[PDB]
Structure 1
Amino acid sequence: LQGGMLYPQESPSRECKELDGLWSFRADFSDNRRRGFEEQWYRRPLWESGPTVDMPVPSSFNDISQDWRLRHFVGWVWYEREVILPERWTQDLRTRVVLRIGSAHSYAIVWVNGVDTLEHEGGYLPFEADISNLVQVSRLRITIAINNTLTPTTLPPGTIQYLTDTSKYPKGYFVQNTYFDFFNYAGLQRSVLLYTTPTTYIDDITVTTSVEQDSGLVNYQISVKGSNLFKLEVRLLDAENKVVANGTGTQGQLKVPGVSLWWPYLMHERPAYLYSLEVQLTAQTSLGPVSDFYTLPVGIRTVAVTKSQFLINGKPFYFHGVNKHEDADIRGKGFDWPLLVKDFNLLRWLGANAFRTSHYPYAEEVMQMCDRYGIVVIDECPGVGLALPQFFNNVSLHHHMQVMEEVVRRDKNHPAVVMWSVANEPASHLESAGYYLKMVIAHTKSLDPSRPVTFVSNSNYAADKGAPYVDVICLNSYYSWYHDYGHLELIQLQLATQFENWYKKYQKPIIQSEYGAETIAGFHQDPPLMFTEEYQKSLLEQYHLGLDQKRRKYVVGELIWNFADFMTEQSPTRVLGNKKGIFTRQRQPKSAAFLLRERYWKIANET
């Protein structure tokens, strides 16, 4: 699809106006879910068409109210905000004004002063529109309708089932079925803002980095929109903002003598060294000469994979990390600065050097933090819950390829991202799924030459039709937890068999990408039983003993499920969500957290 998606920033040529805070909100509870479109609510302020309530942004809407119908609502929700713009934006026609929505859900439509201006399919990814025309020819009214319905061609997929036995269900009953283990929160869960650029502007930047002996090589490619009469100057600044290299034009290669490489946290005493690429555009326009500035952080580092090693900067790397989720009390998947910083403080405390974005791209601000703190990332698209054969077809395939393209567009420049994951626990025993995954992986590889690609599997080693195409094998297993309930004594044997079976077949590096135990804080027993803190500890110890037998050979990582307790749909196996966290949902450590911490610092200190 079209154009770049650079994270907005202030610069000499660009302003940003955050639209955080209260928006007006209404769920459309009409039987056919379309009354808002029938009455065209967007033509007028939202309150004119019925009761509205306040909804905070960014936030999920699902836990904010005490309305019993809203948490599990399936349909369109309607948000609205009125903004007073700086007069300079609306009167000075050299100003380009952009409305950026950080994310939405399955579908979103945006109206600006009642005019339909922007649409987007799929959650967890940003979208924007140049609204200069609507702003410059006295309030801006922004209306956003968001659909949260998951279907056989959304990512994640789902199904909708109407149940028409009127002796067991009321007239019109339907439910949303899903096959992924996290709650389908919705809303405007990420920051919404307006920003400006000149009418000729830096639209896209692509950087890749390599090393020559002790030299750093920074390849850049720059895309400009608007006038095709311009010049580009590019500088690379060191940590103290000294110019160490410079160039020109839409593309080039900068050389950095005696380069400071970007190293993961605990892989170097001074990890995460960031240079900055300052891009300066001088263009000739219809109203005279314009200047545009954008500055992109750059970490000079390489990623490679052998038959048994995962190499960062040509040195063997071992993932000792976690899986996370965008999830917290009350706000759901809503972005929050204090929770963000707290989580990173906990990651560093834990000795974690990595996480996977189970199971969707996280807020960009999370990736920025990773680049700065040296926490490597397996960046994963929302290809989770692909459990039924009907989800694997040509339309879903091409949709999945488009989403991966979006993920790569957004995140291609983060040094912290060291691998792409295209799915989690797809039905990859299916031959249709093997082809599907072959093609999504090949597509991803064709978009970014610089990173390995994988998908995370719970398939049997002999049956997995996607396994041949991954650069690194990522395996989920929960021995004694999802089978042989309580039998801690079986873990080492089953794990040994797992690794031997998989490596014998594929001769590719393996990551244990999930393992854990549901654990209710304060539940204690000796001997240990499932759900106690002691069972969590024991299960971790047995996994750790298994991992020890192969982690200096061909197992190149371990990621605990999960960093913290998080919300899921109601079911008899989910005690107010998923409780496999090593931290509580309120970011305090269960006893197992300390056990894992010891392990991670011990492994890190092996040098």
Structure 2
Amino acid sequence: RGKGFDNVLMVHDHALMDWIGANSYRTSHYPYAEEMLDWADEHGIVVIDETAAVGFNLSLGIKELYSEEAVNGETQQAHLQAIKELIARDKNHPSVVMWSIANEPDTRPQGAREYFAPLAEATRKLDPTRPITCVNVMFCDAHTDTISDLFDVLCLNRYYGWYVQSGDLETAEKVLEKELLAWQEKLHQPIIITEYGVDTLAGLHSMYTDMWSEEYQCAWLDMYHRVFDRVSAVVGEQVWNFADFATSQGILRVGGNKKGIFTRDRKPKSAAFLLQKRWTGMNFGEKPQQGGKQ
């Protein structure tokens, strides 16, 4: 039963998270049901509410389609009502600490700053108790006409040696920090990476830490780690997918896309074993040592 509710799945996944040391997650690319109230509350799990606001590009084959004559008034107003309906529901829930208003929104073409800011300014008027956010794509340089200013914690989710720099970990780190440094200054606000990951086929090992192997995901993941906790600005790290999950038709994606730390049936990849040493060898809720004595 995809996208459907199960008491078991909730008791179990939550047990996974518990074990593996994650205190948080975004309901991603839509609102969930009632894991909110139950789990996050009771166990103090901090959630970053998102909206089913996703897929505002023609920009990633990785035709034609409409270019901002749609994604217009009737759609902004609908986007309005989406944020209405979503604050209606979780405005009490102690586990809600943000409102992500949209994921991966395109910020360059045409009339972007203009559609968007009024919605920052409406939601604001519906909750000022919890700061609002928005989730960035891979365009960066002093960059968004719309996202930069209006939001309180920039949430940036990328794959810096994945669809470009394929498997070059060392340069991808170079590019990673100098661009966190870049993102650091511009806004002098707190930065949370919301989708960091790789695609890894559950049962694949190899000596050369190849792409799509267990030992790549592991090497790759902790490449991030080092430049992560080495930047004052970074305050949130959230690995992109929990489990493999189904995806639309195409190539790039296989049986879903194998982007989970766990598999669809919750069997754990070797990456679950990193993120449980790292993630519990922290003190509760506090940045690790950004350097250890030498």
The TM-score with structure 1 as length reference comes to 0.44
Contact 1:479 1:490 in 2 (8 A): no
Contact 2:244 2:263 in 1 (8 A): yes
Contact 1:520 1:531 in 2 (8 A): yes
Q: In proportion to residue count, which structure has more helix?
A: 2
Paired residues, number: 275
Q: In proportion to residue count, which structure has more strand?
A: 1
Contact 2:148 2:154 in 1 (8 A): yes
Deviations 1:423-479 (A, max 9, x none): 001111235222222121211111012100011001323331122111001111101
Contact 2:36 2:95 in 1 (8 A): no
Does the alignment pair 1:463 with 2:143? yes
Structure 2: distance between partners of 1:405 and 1:606: 31
Summarize the Cα distance change of 1:606–1:407 in structure 2 as closer, same or farther, 3 Å threshold. Answer: closer
Aligned match of 2:197: 516
Contact 1:351 1:604 in 2 (8 A): no
Counterpart code for 1:503:
Q
Contact 2:36 2:93 in 1 (8 A): no
- Kindly report which structure 2 residues correspond to 1:389-468, keeping only aligned pairs within 5 A, or say none: 389-390=67-68, 391-458=70-137, 459-465=139-145, 466-468=147-149
Report percent identity of matched pairs.
Answer: 48
Summarize the Cα distance change of 1:408–1:518 in structure 2 as closer, same or farther, 3 Å threshold. Answer: same
Does the alignment pair 1:385 with 2:66? no
Structure 2: distance between partners of 1:604 and 1:392: 44
How far the C-alpha of 1:366 sits from its partner, in A, is: 4.1
Aligned match of 1:526: 207
Summarize the Cα distance change of 1:470–1:479 in structure 2 as closer, same or farther, 3 Å threshold. Answer: same
Match of 2:38 among 359, 364, 368: 368
Aligned match of 1:302: none
Structure 1: distance between partners of 2:284 and 2:187: 30
How far the C-alpha of 1:368 sits from its partner, in A, is: 2.5
Aligned match of 2:253: 574
Summarize the Cα distance change of 1:538–1:358 in structure 2 as closer, same or farther, 3 Å threshold. Answer: same
Match of 1:359 among 13, 29, 32: 29
Secondary structure of the corresponding residue to residue 77 of structure 2: helix
Aligned match of 1:505: 186
Structure 1: distance between partners of 2:208 and 2:128: 51
Q: Unaligned 5+ residue runs, structure 2?
A: 59-66, 287-294
Structure 1: distance between partners of 2:187 and 2:15: 37
- Kindly report which structure 2 residues correspond to 1:487-566, keeping only aligned pairs within 5 A, or say none: 487-550=168-231, 553-566=232-245
Contact 1:563 1:582 in 2 (8 A): yes
The TM-score with structure 2 as length reference comes to 0.90
Secondary structure of the corresponding residue to residue 86 of structure 2: helix
Structure 1: distance between partners of 2:235 and 2:48: 13
Aligned match of 1:142: none
How far the C-alpha of 1:606 sits from its partner, in A, is: 7.8
Secondary structure of the corresponding residue to residue 102 of structure 2: strand
Contact 2:159 2:196 in 1 (8 A): yes
Q: Unaligned 5+ residue runs, structure 1?
A: 1-330
Counterpart code for 1:477:
R
Higher relative contact order (CA 8 A, sep 6+): 2
Match of 2:20 among 350, 371, 386: 350
Counterpart code for 1:399:
A
- Kindly report which structure 2 residues correspond to 1:232-247, keeping only aligned pairs within 5 A, or say none: none
Counterpart code for 1:428:
T
Counterpart code for 1:423:
A
- Kindly report which structure 2 residues correspond to 1:60-79, keeping only aligned pairs within 5 A, or say none: none
Match of 1:481 among 158, 162, 166: 162
Deviations 1:46-103 (A, max 9, x none): xxxxxxxxxxxxxxxxxxxxxxxxxxxxxxxxxxxxxxxxxxxxxxxxxxxxxxxxxx
How far the C-alpha of 1:359 sits from its partner, in A, is: 0.8
Structure of greater Rg: 1
Structure 2: distance between partners of 1:461 and 1:502: 8
Contact 2:28 2:50 in 1 (8 A): yes
